[PDB]
Every structure is written in C-alpha cells, then in structure tokens.
Design a protein around this ligand. Structure first.
Ligand SMILES: CCCCCCCCCCCCCCCCCC(=O)OC[C@H](COP(=O)([O-])OCC(O)COP(=O)([O-])OC[C@@H](COC(=O)CCCCCCCCCCCCCCCCC)OC(=O)CCCCCCCCCCCCCCCCC)OC(=O)CCCCCCCCCCCCCCCCC
Ligand SMILES: CCCCCCCCCCCCCCCCCC(=O)OC[C@H](COP(=O)([O-])OCC(O)COP(=O)([O-])OC[C@@H](COC(=O)CCCCCCCCCCCCCCCCC)OC(=O)CCCCCCCCCCCCCCCCC)OC(=O)CCCCCCCCCCCCCCCCC
Ligand SMILES: CCCCCCCCCCCCCCCCC[C@@H](O)O[C@H](CO[C@H](O)CCCCCCCCCCCCCCC)COP(=O)(O)OCC[N+](C)(C)C
Ligand SMILES: CCCCCCCCCCCCCCCCCC(=O)OC[C@H](COP(=O)(O)OCCN)OC(=O)CCCCCCCCCCCCCCCCC
Lengths: 121, 174
C-alpha cells in the first residue's frame, strides 16, 4: 500500500477538502462522454435482454442509465485527478528534500560524448 | 537555353562540319528534313507560340524555400530533445542535398560518355576523377549507417574515423 496510511488521511472519505483546489473536470470531458456511452450501451443491452425494441422502447430508462453513469463518472474523475495530483506533490517534495539522492548532473554535448559506431553491412 | 545553368551542367562547344558533297545525286536526308520542317516544325512552332502568348497574360511566380542554419548534434546536449530534433532535421536536409549533388555528378559522367562516343576512355577522364572523389567522400560520410540512420550514428562514425586518423598519424610520426 503506497499511499494508504499517508499522514493526515481521513478514513472513508471519497474526496477530502484539499481536493477542492484542483480544476474540476469539464462536463464535456472525453472521459465523461465515454461514461455516458457506457450508460447508453447498458440501456440498449437491457432492451435487448428484455426483448423490447432496442432503440425505441424505454426512453426514460435509457436516460436514467446515461445520467447515472455520467454522475458517477464525474465524481470518479475528480477522485482520480486528486490522487494523481497527490502523487506528483509527494514525489516533488521528496526530490526537493533529498538532493544527495537526486543530484543535478553536468550535461555533456554529443561532441564530447563518445559512442561506439556499429556499421550495418 | 536559360532553363538550366551552364556552369552546373557544362556542355563543350559543338563543332559541326560543313557539308561538302561530291556527287550530283540529290540528298534524300536533305529532302526529308525539308519536308519535316514544312509539315511538323512550323505547326508545332505556331502552337507553342499560341500557348506562350496565353501564358504571358497570367504571369505569376513561385519561390525557393530558404532554411536558416541551426545548431547541430555536436552542439546539442545529451537527451535535449528539442535541439536533437532541430539538428536531426538539418542533417536529413543535408543528406538529401548531398544525394542530389552525387546525382548531378553522375549525370555529368553519363552525358560526357555519350557525347564523346568512341573516344570516351580518354576524353572523359576529367569527369571520372570528379565522380571518383565525390563518391569517395559521400561513401565515407554515409556508407554503412543502416536503415535507421541518424545524426548521432553519423557523428559516432565520424568520431571513429577521426580516432583512426589520429592513431595512424601518431604511428607514422613514431
Ligand atoms: C456515442 C458517444 C458520443 C456522442 C456524440 C458526442 C457527445 C458529446 C459531445 C461533446 O461533449 O463533445 C466535446 C468533446 C471534445 O472534447 P475536448 O474537451 O475538446 O477535448 C480536449 C480534452 O481536454 C483532451 O482530449 P484528448 O484528446 O487529450 O483526449 C484524451 C484521451 C486520450 O486517450 C488516448 O490517447 C487513448 C484512447 C483509447 C484508449 C483505449 C484503447 C483501447 C480500447 C479500444 C476500445 C475498446 C472498447 C470498444 O483519453 C480519453 O479520452 C479517455 C477515454 C478514451 C476513449 C475516449 C472516447 C471518446 C468518445 C466516446 C464514445 C466512443 C464510442 C466508440 C464507439 C462508437 C459506436 C457508435 O467531444 C468528444 O469528447 C467527442 C468524442 C468523439 C465522439 C464520437 C465517437 C468517436 C469514437 C472514436 C473512437 C476511437 C478514438
Ligand atoms: C452499433 C455499433 C456498436 C459498436 C460496439 C460498441 C459496443 C456495443 C454496442 C452497445 C450494445 C448494442 C445493443 C446490443 C444488442 C443488440 C440486439 C439487436 O438485435 O440489436 C438490433 C437493433 C435493432 O433491432 P430491433 O428491431 O430493435 O430488434 C431486433 C432483434 O434484436 C433481433 O433479434 P434476433 O433474435 O434476430 O437476434 C439474433 C442475433 C442477436 O445478436 C446480437 O444481439 C448481437 C449484438 C449483441 C452482442 C454483444 C454486443 C456488445 C456488448 C459489449 C461487448 C464488447 C463490445 C466491443 C467488442 C470489441 C471486440 C469485438 O444473434 C445472432 O445473430 C447470432 C449470430 C452471431 C453471433 C456471433 C457474433 C457476436 C458479436 C458480438 C460482438 C458485437 C460487437 C458490436 C455490437 C453489435 C450490435 C450493435 O440495432 C441496434 O441495437 C443497433 C445499435 C444501436 C444504434 C443506435 C443509433 C442511434 C441513432 C444514431 C446515433 C448516431 C451517433 C450518435 C451521435 C449523433 C450523430 C448525429
Ligand atoms: C460534514 C459531513 C460531510 C460528509 C460527506 C461524506 C464524506 C465521504 C463519505 C463516504 C461514504 C460513507 C462511507 C461509506 C463507504 C465509503 C467508501 C469510499 O467512500 O471510501 C473511499 C474508497 O473509494 C473507493 O476505493 C474508490 C471506488 C473506485 C470505483 C472504480 C474503481 C476503479 C476501476 C478501474 C476501471 C474503472 C472503470 C469505470 C468504473 C465505472 C476511500 O476510503 P479509504 O479509507 O481510503 O479505503 C481504505 C482501504 N484502502 C486503503 C485499501 C483503499
Ligand atoms: C433519449 C434516449 C436516451 C439517451 C439520452 C442521451 C442524452 C443524455 C444527456 C442529455 C443532455 C444533458 C445536458 O444538459 O448535457 C449538457 C452537458 C454539457 O453542457 P455544458 O458542459 O454545461 O456546456 C458546454 C460547455 N462548453 O453534456 C454533457 O455533460 C454530456 C454528458 C453525456 C454524454 C452522452 C454521450 C452520448 C450517449 C449516447 C446518446 C445517443 C442518443 C440517441 C437517441 C435516439 C432516440 C431515438
């Protein structure tokens, strides 16, 4: 468990207060659109299984499928973005605090770097 | 003609002997040349004159792209992706230009052999030496880079060649 037991972590909290400082996902996000597509596919499969006209019947049910999937997808995207931001924050802080472990290296140009040449013949 | 550059594509002056007939018989070649001029050359010349008149009314121009020089892979730092990209693109353009240079020299060689005809072995030695030198330099530059050639591989080959030349010079001086 990498990020479990991280200091200051409130248990059973889907989204903490420190995640409110990040940009929320746009409602037209491609991932949100894919969640809506999954909901629509679920509605079509429901119609097919219950032997109703696949594209015609149950418009209210299909709308509920799409809306529920988009709702949960929006919240899931927020949590995913927050966790990745947390990982980047921790990695940067550790690199900053351990310079002897992450030292800057002098950059040698390719004129000074010697590389062996292997002909193709 | 002004279509191409005479200095880039040289042609020796053309020496055509004057006709010196010794018989009273008519020349079928002369008669057929007159017929060809009367029936073909005049109509095609008139057609080209009309076409060129139509072209001169819509005269527009196009230009030759110029690329400014950029630092090469020697100047680029290690794993500096942007400088590496610029240098690699420049090296590829230089490779294309060198290929076209070799093509021009080869065209010189072929045209000279055909023009000289039966005395090509002696009269085309000047163009053979230029082709030999250009091909030697081009081969040393881009001989065995491979299918996935790159500026880094060409630089590594040049470093190997320079090290070999330095070692040979040191051994000779020893
Ligand atoms: C039906 C559904 C669509 C209805 C019409 C659109 C309604 C919504 C309109 C809207 O809001 O538009 C604004 C929005 C514009 O977004 P934006 O804000 O301008 O983008 C900028 C982003 O910030 C940044 O954008 P980005 O370019 O960086 O995108 C990041 C991308 C980077 O992702 C990648 O690099 C990898 C992507 C593939 C990953 C998986 C590969 C392996 C799996 C293959 C598929 C398996 C299942 C089958 O990652 C993702 O998008 C994550 C999800 C990956 C899939 C995205 C699919 C989007 C369309 C959803 C419906 C697809 C239906 C397909 C079948 C259709 C049958 C009729 O438009 C869309 O999102 C429309 C997308 C196209 C819809 C038509 C269907 C195309 C299907 C293409 C399939 C191949 C690709
Ligand atoms: C549409 C492209 C989809 C691409 C993939 C995306 C994922 C799948 C789509 C979501 C699920 C769709 C529904 C599934 C069940 C369909 C059942 C059916 O009959 O459907 C016929 C149904 C119409 O027929 P119906 O009169 O309602 O009822 C006829 C009876 O069902 C007739 O009943 P029956 O008793 O005659 O049925 C017998 C038939 C029953 O056969 C089926 O039911 C086959 C279809 C279901 C199989 C599983 C589907 C996939 C589920 C997810 C799995 C992963 C998908 C990706 C896989 C990738 C690798 C392959 O069984 C056989 O033929 C057995 C032999 C073949 C077996 C071996 C082949 C199996 C292939 C399985 C994979 C198929 C994947 C592609 C999807 C194909 C269907 C759309 O047509 C559709 O549902 C068409 C699709 C929906 C179109 C919506 C259009 C909306 C308006 C335009 C929108 C424009 C774009 C939006 C933006 C705005 C632009 C302006
Ligand atoms: C003022 C009061 C306001 C209160 C507001 C509510 C605060 C949050 C309340 C949460 C609900 C009450 C508790 C009910 C159970 C909570 C479950 C959830 O909220 O907890 C989170 C859990 O969230 C879930 O784990 C994330 C669900 C993700 C669902 C998708 C999984 C990803 C699959 C990848 C493909 C996705 C495909 C598309 C999916 C639809 C974090 O809990 P955590 O203490 O830390 O877990 C400890 C165990 N660990 C450490 C091992 C993890
Ligand atoms: C009817 C049958 C059931 C299918 C219903 C499909 C539509 C469901 C959504 C209805 C509209 C909801 C809405 O208001 O969406 C707006 C929102 C974007 O709005 P917003 O981001 O605020 O503005 C743009 C900012 N630049 O938009 C979003 O957030 C988009 C999220 C949903 C993405 C859905 C992707 C397509 C799903 C398949 C649709 C197929 C429809 C076929 C209908 C056939 C009818 C016979």
């Amino acid at each position: 468990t990498m990020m479990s037991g991280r200091p200051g972590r409130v248990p059973l909290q889907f989204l903490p207060n420190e995640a409110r400082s990040l940009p929320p996902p746009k409602l037209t996000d491609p991932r949100l659109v894919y969640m809506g597509f999954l909901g629509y596919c679920s509605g079509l499969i429901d119609n097919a299984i219950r032997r109703r006209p696949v594209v015609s019947a149950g418009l209210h049910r299909q709308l509920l499928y799409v809306t529920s999937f988009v709702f949960f997808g929006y919240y899931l995207l927020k949590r995913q973005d927050y966790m990745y931001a947390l990982r980047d924050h921790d990695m940067f802080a550790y690199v900053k605090s351990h310079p002897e472990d992450f030292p800057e290296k002098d950059k040698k140009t390719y004129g000074e770097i010697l590389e062996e040449f292997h002909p193709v013949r | 003609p002004d279509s191409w550059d005479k200095d880039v594509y040289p042609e020796p002056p053309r020496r055509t002997p004057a006709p010196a007939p010794q018989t009273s018989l008519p020349n079928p070649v002369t008669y057929l040349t007159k017929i060809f001029d009367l029936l073909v050359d005049r109509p095609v010349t008139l057609a080209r004159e009309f076409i060129e008149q139509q072209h001169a009314k819509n005269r527009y121009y196009y230009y030759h792209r110029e690329f400014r020089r950029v630092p090469d892979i020697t100047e680029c730092e290690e794993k500096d992706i942007l400088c590496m990209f610029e240098a690699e693109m420049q090296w590829r353009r230089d490779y294309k230009v060198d290929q076209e240079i070799v093509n021009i020299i080869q065209e010189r060689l072929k045209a000279c052999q055909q023009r000289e005809g039966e005395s090509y072995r002696q009269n085309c030695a000047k163009e053979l030496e230029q082709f030999t030198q250009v091909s030697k330099a081009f081969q040393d530059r881009y001989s065995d880079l491979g299918a996935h050639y790159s500026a880094r591989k060409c630089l590594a080959k040049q470093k190997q060649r320079m090290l070999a030349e330095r070692k040979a010079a040191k051994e000779a001086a020893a």
